[PDB]
């Protein structure tokens, strides 16, 4: 199990995804033209996980760029590393999805999905042993949300035994483009609950607050939020991208982080986030301010945690400090999953830092995220507000009732394990 197929859909999924390939291309020593110029062989050992090797010693991201309108893709092609993607791996239409999940899922997106699946199959067929798929997208718009979840369904149908992993940006009223975001997100969460194995939940308000309250950026842009996401995505994929103590792939991750199939929505975090020591990395990576789901972990309990340290540092002080925090936060870890906190280390630090830490928590506190979405959804749905945008695409109110009912069920299942 080596190759991962990456998919990025819609404006948000494509802008975060572009940044992700920029960051990991740097780490692995690939330049904007796909040529390797690295000082270490740790960089090439697991390069095939994310890059196809072409003739001429070039490495091409195993990446598929999807959108229902051309703008963001054009931006990407003109971007820093735009020329590194396979040109025939851009798949886009002209109409757009109007921030409308029904257009992404059922109409506009349905017209385009087969050609996306052609490229997916072409990337999969040239895999020695496909691990699975990683999708980047937002849940609040139309393409990444509606078409993204459509893609996931059709990938599951064609590759039912592969791991499906998403980086899903969750809308917040504080950092919002349209009022329909709660509708699009409630509809998508229903899909994610049934069809992914691992979903990193990234809350745009959490990203904003980190940029504004902690990093002291007077006026964050989406670019500032996306720099945080790409840093975190580099962190959570370190163990896939570099050798180490662990034999780490997407399946071992799901087996160890997901005790019940539906509870697979992780809170990620990054450290340091300050405006230099191991105890500093460790204290930060465990407080709410470094987490990206806008959920207070102290309001719930961790079922499982994965922590990945990067840089030269004392493994002894690492293990020592991890074991310390588990007593400061003794009550916030469930007692019926022994040894549910896994530490991994990588020697290679991210650019611009001597050391760093990425946190992946499966905490019952993430129920707060789905509660917020559910309340916003219900405030509008009780009055059927904005629904004509969806009924106009052939959808029926009952599909909204079922999505709301499924998400409220999800909330109740988290609460069940928080009292166990």
């Amino acid at each position: 199990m080596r190759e991962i197929v990456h998919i990025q859909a819609g404006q948000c999924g494509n802008q975060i995804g572009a940044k992700f390939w920029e960051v990991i291309s740097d780490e692995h020593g690939i330049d904007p033209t796909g040529s390797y110029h690295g000082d270490s062989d740790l960089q090439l050992e697991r390069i095939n996980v994310y890059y196809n090797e072409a003739t001429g010693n070039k490495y091409v991201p195993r990446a598929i760029l999807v959108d229902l309108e051309p703008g963001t893709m054009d931006s990407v092609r003109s971007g820093p590393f735009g020329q590194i993607f396979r040109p025939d791996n851009f798949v886009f239409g002209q109409s757009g999805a109007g921030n409308n999940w029904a257009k992404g899922h059922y109409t506009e997106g349905a017209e385009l999905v087969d050609s996306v699946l052609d490229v997916v199959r072409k990337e999969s067929e040239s895999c020695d042993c496909l691990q699975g798929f990683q999708l980047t997208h937002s849940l609040g718009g139309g393409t990444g949300s509606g078409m993204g979840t459509l893609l996931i369904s059709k990938i599951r149908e064609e590759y039912p035994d592969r791991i499906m992993n998403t980086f899903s940006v969750m809308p917040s009223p504080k950092v919002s483009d349209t009022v329909v975001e709660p509708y699009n997100a409630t509809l998508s969460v229903h899909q994610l609950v049934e069809n992914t194995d691992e979903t990193y939940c990234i809350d745009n308000e959490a990203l904003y607050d980190i940029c504004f309250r902690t990093l002291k950026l007077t006026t964050p842009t989406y670019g500032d939020l996306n720099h945080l996401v790409s840093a975190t995505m580099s962190g959570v994929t370190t163990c896939l991208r570099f050798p180490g103590q662990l034999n780490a792939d997407l399946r071992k991750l799901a087996v160890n982080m997901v005790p019940f199939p539906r509870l697979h929505f992780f809170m990620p975090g990054f450290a340091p986030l300050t405006s230099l020591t191991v105890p500093e990395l460790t204290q930060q990576m465990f407080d709410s301010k470094n987490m990206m789901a806008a959920c207070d972990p102290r309001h719930g309990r961790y079922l499982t945690v994965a922590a990945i340290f990067r840089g030269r540092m004392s493994m002894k002080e690492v293990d020592e400090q991890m074991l310390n925090v588990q007593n400061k936060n003794s009550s916030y870890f469930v007692e019926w999953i022994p040894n549910n906190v896994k530490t991994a280390v990588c020697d290679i630090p991210p650019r611009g830092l001597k050391m760093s830490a990425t946190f992946i928590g499966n905490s019952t506190a993430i129920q707060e995220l789905f509660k917020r979405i559910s309340e916003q959804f219900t405030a509008m749905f009780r009055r059927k507000a904005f629904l004509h945008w969806y009924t106009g695409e052939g959808m029926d109110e009952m599909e909204f009732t079922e999505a709301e009912s499924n998400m409220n069920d999800l909330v109740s299942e988290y609460q069940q394990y928080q009292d166990a």
Binding site: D319, E320, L323, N327, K328, S330, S331, E335, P338
Partner: protein, 353 residues
């Protein structure tokens, strides 16, 4: 922050230790089955010693010595003594005792009658007592001068028992012509230092000693629970039939022209050390992956010659009400904070070995 768990609800001693640990601000009580504790205050039975000492990054400490039951069960005490050369069949401070398993369930039944018959050829006091660990507070015992009556009682019971020579010449406190027993509290720490709490207690009897009838049993048994239920003058001479060392030492001076230390404590200290040094190789945690301490209750009898006799060792003792605060503080100071420092004139006598 240090962490501990409570697994014996009915413990007066550790209930107080628990409280003191919170009151220092640096101890958190976790839930009963949380494995990431520094200290376990264990259950009295089937404590999971096998689960201690495998939590990485945690020094773990438990308030019981695994194996100490060998001293703290009446039948095993007898066995241990007769089979350990340091103690021996010839031990001078332990009453002649035999393990008698009842037929309705190796047995020393024959060896007992052999020595019993010798005494019958004596006109010497041939009174004995049958006891067991299944005793309640405090019934479950029989005092008889007749051998067949003792084996009849035990076989009525169908449980492991011991027969033990009754001390026919107890030291009798005056006024009152009354019998007593001495309880000493002993704390053994993780280094196997043996600490005798400077405060003991005599559990006195309020009824004059009566060699005529061992049938009554109230002037013969010194248990506090007994005296409150089947007595006559419970509380006449001392509050709660509890005499403490300061008064008892004064008594020994005034009446006998000696001291508690010379006439009794040397022997108590000798016995305690003997018993505990004997089992030390079997129960010591010096090189174990977890650590133990334990509080013991030693019960002694004094004869009219001022000779001290070990009666039994209790592995889960309660304290006297007047002494809880001092002793429990002493546990925290000596057995816990010694392993987990927080941030006098000791109340204990260290028994050197």
């Amino acid at each position: 922050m240090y962490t501990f768990v409570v697994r014996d609800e009915n413990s007066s001693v550790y209930a107080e230790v628990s409280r003191l640990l919170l009151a220092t601000g640096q101890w958190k009580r976790l839930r009963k089955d949380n494995p990431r504790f520094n200290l376990m205050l264990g259950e009295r039975n089937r404590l999971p010693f096998g689960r201690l000492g495998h939590e990485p990054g945690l020094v773990q400490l438990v308030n019981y010595y695994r194996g100490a039951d060998k001293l703290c069960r009446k039948a095993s005490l007898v066995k241990l003594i007769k089979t350990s050369p340091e103690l021996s069949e010839s031990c001078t401070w332990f009453p002649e005792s035999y393990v008698i398993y009842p037929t309705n369930l190796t047995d020393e039944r024959e060896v007992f009658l052999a020595a019993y018959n010798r005494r019958r050829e004596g006109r010497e006091g041939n009174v004995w007592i049958a006891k067991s660990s299944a005793g309640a507070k405090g019934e479950g015992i029989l005092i008889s001068s007749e051998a067949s009556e003792l084996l009849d009682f035990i076989d009525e019971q169908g449980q492991v028992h011991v027969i033990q020579k009754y001390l026919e010449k107890p030291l009798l406190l005056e006024p009152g012509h009354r019998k007593f027993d001495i309880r000493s509290w002993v704390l053994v720490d993780h280094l196997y230092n043996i600490y005798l709490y400077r405060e003991g207690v005599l559990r006195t009897s309020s009824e004059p000693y009566n060699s005529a009838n061992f049938q009554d049993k109230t002037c013969h048994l010194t248990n506090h629970c007994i005296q409150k239920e089947y007595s006559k003058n419970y509380g006449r001479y001392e509050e709660g039939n509890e005499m403490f060392f300061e008064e008892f030492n004064q008594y020994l001076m005034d009446a006998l022209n000696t001291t508690l230390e010379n006439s009794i404590l040397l022997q108590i200290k000798h016995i305690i050390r003997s018993c505990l040094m004997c089992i030390e190789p079997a129960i010591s945690t010096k090189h174990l992956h977890y650590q133990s301490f334990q509080l013991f209750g030693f019960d002694f009898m004094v004869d009219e010659e001022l000779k001290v006799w070990l009666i039994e060792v209790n592995g889960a003792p309660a304290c006297a009400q007047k002494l809880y605060a001092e002793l429990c503080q002493g546990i925290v100071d000596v057995a816990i904070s010694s392993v987990f420092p927080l941030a006098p004139t000791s109340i204990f006598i260290k028994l050197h070995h």
